[PDB]
Amino acid sequence: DKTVRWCAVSEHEATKCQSFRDHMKSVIPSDGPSVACVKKASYLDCIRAIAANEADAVTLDAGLVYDAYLAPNNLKPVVAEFYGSKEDPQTFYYAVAVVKKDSGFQMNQLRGKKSCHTGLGRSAGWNIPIGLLYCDLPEPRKPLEKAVANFFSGSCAPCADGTDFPQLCQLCPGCGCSTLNQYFGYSGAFKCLKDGAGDVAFVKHSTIFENLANKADRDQYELLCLDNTRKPVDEYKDCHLAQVPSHTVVARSMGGKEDLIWELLNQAQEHFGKDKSKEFQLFSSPHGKDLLFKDSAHGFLKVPPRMDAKMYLGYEYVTAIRNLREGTCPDECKPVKWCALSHHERLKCDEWSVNSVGKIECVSAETTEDCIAKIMNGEADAMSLDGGFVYIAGKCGLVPVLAENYNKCEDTPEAGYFAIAVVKKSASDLTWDNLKGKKSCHTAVGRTAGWNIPMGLLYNKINHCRFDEFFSEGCAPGSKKDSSLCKLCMGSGLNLCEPNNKEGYYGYTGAFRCLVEKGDVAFVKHQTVPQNTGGKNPDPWAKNLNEKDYELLCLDGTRKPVEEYANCHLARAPNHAVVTRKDKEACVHKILRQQQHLFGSNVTDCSGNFCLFRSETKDLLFRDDTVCLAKLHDRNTYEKYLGEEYVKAVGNLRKCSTSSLLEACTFRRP
Ligand SMILES: *[C@@H]1O[C@H](CO)[C@@H](O)[C@H](O)[C@H]1NC(C)=O
Ligand SMILES: [Fe+3]
Ligand SMILES: [N]
Ligand SMILES: [N]
Ligand SMILES: [Pt+2]
């Protein structure tokens, strides 16, 4: 049978669960999911139980979601509770540090300030902040209450041991652990700040808005960002300590019933959810309060499948709660863990590693998205991306550091490549203005030159991104294998239409090969045709060609030889870039520039010697067209770097794209 064993942690909870089971039997057909009710002693027991394969699901607070993630439990989030609006789910909240305007300090300057806490042991008001500040705490850090009283000059920490550590109760003597204390709770801690008792108050993103009606008043207040800037209170989503999931159903990583769990809970909310007016409410029980699910919930969203536990909690959270749980502190820039896609990339990376003598290390992952995810959650530090991946890496909170440069260095804005529409000279009927029902070749989908620029522009002409209806057939590696845009792809087995090496029509060169062999139009960079014509490319497919046989398509409507790319382009392309985490801009920016003048475009004969912009077999780690790694100056946002023109386009293209890492990242940041 298709049963979901639900874990209760109390007698009251089991009773509800039983009702849940029973009422489900009225509504669900026997060709549908069941509830079995498993009572355990605690949330930890439940976690073990699921891991043990004695239960299937339980709903956890964020701290516990973390514990469940850890081996030997290896549970993951599968369904999220949402609150209030359907349009706007209240899935996550943000822990913020709120300060007075012009109080004149940053996150890294909190030592000897007056802090306001919502209460000891609360996440937003304690666990998170103190978790992040853990390594700044004076030794010994046990007891933690002591080391915190020795950090801040004085504070209000409700439920703190004021008897032993008076500096914790200095703003609220006795440390009222109830609402008799004025400085207790969400509104409480915020009051502590407003009443000018404390310099900073650790609260939810929403506390500030619930305790100050008029915008005029809210302008007196800023947020401390972790990058040690401040920001208005309205920009809590870019300036927070952590992003915390409210209530999460969790399953086994592999062999869970994610699918079945969702099916059950979905049908469940359908018939018994908010205002379904039945005898059984899913978010209410006469037995108690918050049984199985928060009573305040409005329903469930399915957690996107790409989402592991670490990615769901976020880097900040994991960091803080890890420090709390482990309690391990270490200095300048350690090794930079670089992310390698392939076995051949890994090989080039091992060379780079041992040459810097430890100053570079190599983590490797299967796909690019696998690599981004590793940078995100700090298993890896940096890698080089296409502009279209930079977009994604950005939407996931990674930032660009250094652009790859092709032209002759260090300081150069622009310097980007050209998106070009390459045709065969002979068919003179082809124009940019009328490419409908033509065969087409893309580098991959979601790539700058191959997809983002060309299809971006083309969208402004058809007003949809369903391009496999516009073009007759084509090859656009990374499409749905059943799409007409996988018809031309030359990949064999499960490699057909796959955006990797094992698809011959993948990338700049591959899309051109496609054009040559099968397509009517290829979307590639300007440098592509020259490099793979006139005997330069020694492969049979490319050997005996010459660029005179090929032409570009210009926006106005005309054509021009492969040389007039100067003004026969589609648009200028955001250069390929190096992405990392906000908290590594400094580290990466430094160690790379230093690894550049050692092994860059100022030592030749890259045989026995090491070069950074040389590859054994095609562009490994960095392109081969690369000469130097540029400073970005202002442009270290994925918006600022790509430009709003690129972004507006990719925004439109998103309506159709299939990226699962993007899907997960925009679950947290809609
Ligand atoms: C490449 O750099 C040179 C340096 O002066 C510049 O003249 C040239 O225009 C650049 N690239 C282009 C757009 O041709
Ligand atoms: Fe590119
Ligand atoms: N597994
Ligand atoms: N597993
Ligand atoms: Pt497994």
Side-chain angles (χ1 to χ4, degrees):
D1 57 56
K2 309 184 298 159
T3 189
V4 172
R5 297 163 301 167
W6 201 284
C7 206
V9 299
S10 71
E11 306 211 306
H12 291 293
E13 271 211 352
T15 316
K16 174 170 184 175
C17 177
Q18 290 169 350
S19 277
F20 182 21
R21 151 173 49 68
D22 298 320
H23 291 61
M24 273 308 109
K25 288 220 295 291
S26 291
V27 281
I28 274 68
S30 51
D31 294 346
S34 313
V35 188
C37 294
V38 180
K39 187 223 169 311
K40 285 291 197 300
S42 62
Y43 285 113
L44 214 87
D45 280 313
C46 270
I47 288 173
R48 300 178 182 188
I50 296 169
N53 190 11
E54 302 188 353
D56 300 312
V58 71
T59 316
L60 291 188
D61 275 338
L64 279 166
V65 166
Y66 178 74
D67 306 309
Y69 135 69
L70 284 176
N73 316 299
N74 315 72
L75 302 185
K76 64 166 198 159
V78 298
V79 186
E81 268 179 44
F82 82 76
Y83 311 79
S85 174
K86 279 66 186 172
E87 312 294 300
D88 164 60
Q90 292 306 300
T91 310
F92 299 82
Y93 67 100
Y94 304 77
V96 298
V98 181
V99 286
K100 285 278 197 171
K101 175 72 70 68
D102 309 309
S103 49
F105 61 76
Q106 300 291 347
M107 185 65 69
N108 60 317
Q109 284 172 287
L110 277 178
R111 184 164 74 182
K113 304 286 157 300
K114 292 169 293 170
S115 57
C116 308
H117 304 294
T118 64
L120 192 106
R122 292 193 175 191
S123 70
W126 182 265
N127 296 337
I128 296 168
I130 305 301
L132 296 180
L133 297 180
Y134 186 77
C135 284
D136 299 348
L137 293 196
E139 317 194 17
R141 313 187 216 245
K142 295 207 283 284
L144 174 81
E145 275 198 55
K146 186 160 189 174
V148 177
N150 264 295
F151 186 80
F152 304 101
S153 53
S155 53
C156 180
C159 324
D161 172 358
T163 304
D164 307 2
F165 310 122
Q167 313 93 309
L168 296 182
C169 300
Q170 187 214 285
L171 303 206
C172 57
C175 275
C177 191
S178 74
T179 53
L180 294 205
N181 186 352
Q182 51 164 13
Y183 290 158
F184 160 100
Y186 279 113
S187 50
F190 176 65
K191 201 160 172 297
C192 169
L193 170 86
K194 169 168 61 55
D195 295 354
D199 308 304
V200 58
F202 304 106
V203 294
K204 284 182 59 187
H205 63 293
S206 54
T207 293
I208 164 73
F209 294 81
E210 304 166 309
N211 292 257
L212 276 187
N214 300 285
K215 187 185 192 298
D217 304 291
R218 297 191 273 82
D219 297 354
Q220 311 312 113
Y221 296 101
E222 295 178 299
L223 303 173
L224 296 189
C225 314
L226 284 170
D227 62 342
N228 326 305
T229 83
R230 287 159 173 234
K231 273 194 182 61
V233 287
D234 310 72
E235 313 179 10
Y236 51 76
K237 32 211 305 165
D238 309 84
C239 194
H240 58 255
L241 295 204
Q243 171 167 350
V244 196
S246 300
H247 222 227
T248 307
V249 175
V250 301
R252 258 166 272 116
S253 295
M254 235 196 109
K257 284 85 158 292
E258 307 90 359
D259 46 352
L260 194 74
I261 292 165
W262 171 240
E263 181 179 357
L264 166 72
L265 287 187
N266 204 0
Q267 289 296 322
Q269 81 177 301
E270 195 53 58
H271 306 135
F272 298 109
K274 183 73 178 194
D275 303 320
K276 282 298 184 295
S277 295
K278 304 292 175 65
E279 80 173 312
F280 177 69
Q281 272 91 17
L282 196 59
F283 306 116
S284 167
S285 197
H287 280 104
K289 203 255 183 293
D290 286 338
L291 292 196
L292 288 188
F293 307 107
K294 291 202 209 296
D295 284 343
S296 54
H298 280 71
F300 303 125
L301 301 185
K302 182 160 71 63
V303 169
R306 182 52 187 100
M307 200 82 87
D308 76 351
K310 287 212 274 186
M311 188 178 335
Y312 194 61
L313 293 189
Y315 178 64
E316 291 67 50
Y317 190 79
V318 171
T319 309
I321 193 172
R322 195 211 309 112
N323 297 312
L324 278 209
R325 250 144 264 227
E326 286 166 358
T328 307
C329 292
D331 298 69
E332 77 293 353
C333 291
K334 309 183 177 186
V336 178
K337 283 180 265 70
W338 192 280
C339 211
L341 290 191
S342 65
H343 167 61
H344 278 103
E345 273 207 1
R346 183 56 205 249
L347 286 188
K348 181 184 172 185
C349 192
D350 283 303
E351 291 178 59
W352 189 14
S353 180
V354 62
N355 292 10
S356 40
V357 192
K359 272 308 182 75
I360 299 286
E361 289 177 4
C362 301
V363 174
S364 47
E366 264 60 9
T367 84
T368 303
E369 299 195 354
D370 286 346
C371 264
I372 292 181
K374 286 200 174 197
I375 302 171
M376 268 169 87
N377 76 13
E379 292 182 11
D381 294 318
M383 64 177 309
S384 184
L385 289 195
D386 174 45
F389 271 139
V390 155
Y391 177 82
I392 294 175
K395 277 279 185 173
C396 293
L398 304 184
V399 288
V401 182
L402 297 168
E404 311 195 82
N405 284 11
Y406 307 131
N407 188 3
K408 275 180 183 171
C409 207
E410 194 76 61
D411 293 60
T412 308
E414 182 43 66
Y417 54 106
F418 283 101
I420 310 298
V422 177
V423 281
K424 194 162 182 284
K425 202 83 185 301
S426 65
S428 283
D429 42 338
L430 276 183
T431 59
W432 169 240
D433 299 359
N434 290 291
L435 270 178
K436 186 198 173 71
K438 307 305 174 184
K439 295 152 149 64
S440 71
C441 303
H442 313 255
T443 59
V445 46
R447 301 301 173 75
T448 296
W451 184 273
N452 284 345
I453 304 173
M455 294 308 101
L457 304 183
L458 173 60
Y459 177 104
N460 299 8
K461 295 185 180 189
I462 55 174
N463 308 305
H464 62 72
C465 39
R466 291 132 32 202
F467 295 117
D468 64 305
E469 298 170 4
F470 181 72
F471 301 118
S472 63
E473 66 190 315
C475 182
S479 296
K480 294 190 176 175
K481 308 300 178 63
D482 66 295
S483 172
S484 69
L485 284 193
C486 290
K487 249 80 173 187
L488 297 191
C489 299
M490 58 153 289
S492 43
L494 44 96
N495 294 290
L496 178 64
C497 200
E498 210 62 62
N500 60 66
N501 297 353
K502 312 195 76 172
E503 161 72 57
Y505 288 180
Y506 164 65
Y508 294 120
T509 302
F512 177 63
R513 180 177 183 179
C514 174
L515 169 70
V516 172
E517 291 175 353
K518 294 179 198 177
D520 298 353
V521 57
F523 308 101
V524 282
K525 57 173 183 182
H526 56 297
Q527 324 170 203
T528 302
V529 181
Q531 285 170 106
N532 301 298
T533 56
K536 289 145 196 168
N537 195 327
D539 294 305
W541 79 259
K543 275 193 62 172
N544 207 62
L545 319 184
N546 53 65
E547 73 168 76
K548 192 197 174 175
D549 298 300
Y550 295 112
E551 213 163 7
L552 317 186
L553 295 175
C554 326
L555 281 192
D556 58 308
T558 58
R559 333 212 314 187
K560 276 177 183 60
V562 160
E563 280 316 302
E564 266 79 61
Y565 62 65
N567 49 59
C568 192
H569 58 298
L570 287 171
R572 200 84 176 228
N575 236 17
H576 279 216
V578 184
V579 295
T580 197
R581 293 179 305 257
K582 280 289 284 288
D583 56 289
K584 291 286 284 191
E585 273 185 291
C587 259
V588 172
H589 206 300
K590 188 194 295 176
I591 300 292
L592 279 197
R593 275 174 50 124
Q594 193 170 7
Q595 278 295 294
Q596 196 191 124
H597 83 295
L598 259 82
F599 304 107
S601 300
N602 54 60
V603 61
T604 55
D605 54 285
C606 306
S607 193
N609 298 54
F610 183 70
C611 300
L612 202 77
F613 311 128
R614 174 276 310 123
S615 303
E616 296 299 295
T617 45
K618 302 281 175 292
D619 318 74
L620 256 41
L621 287 75
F622 306 85
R623 314 221 87 275
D624 290 345
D625 313 72
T626 313
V627 285
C628 71
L629 292 171
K631 279 166 50 61
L632 295 192
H633 299 123
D634 175 64
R635 299 184 165 191
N636 43 51
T637 292
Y638 83 85
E639 276 99 346
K640 288 189 296 181
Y641 183 77
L642 300 187
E644 86 280 352
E645 281 315 301
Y646 189 103
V647 167
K648 267 189 62 198
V650 175
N652 280 359
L653 285 188
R654 278 194 59 181
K655 295 185 172 74
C656 290
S657 91
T658 50
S659 185
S660 58
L661 189 100
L662 177 89
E663 180 190 57
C665 286
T666 63
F667 188 75
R668 323 215 326 121
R669 212 194 193 312

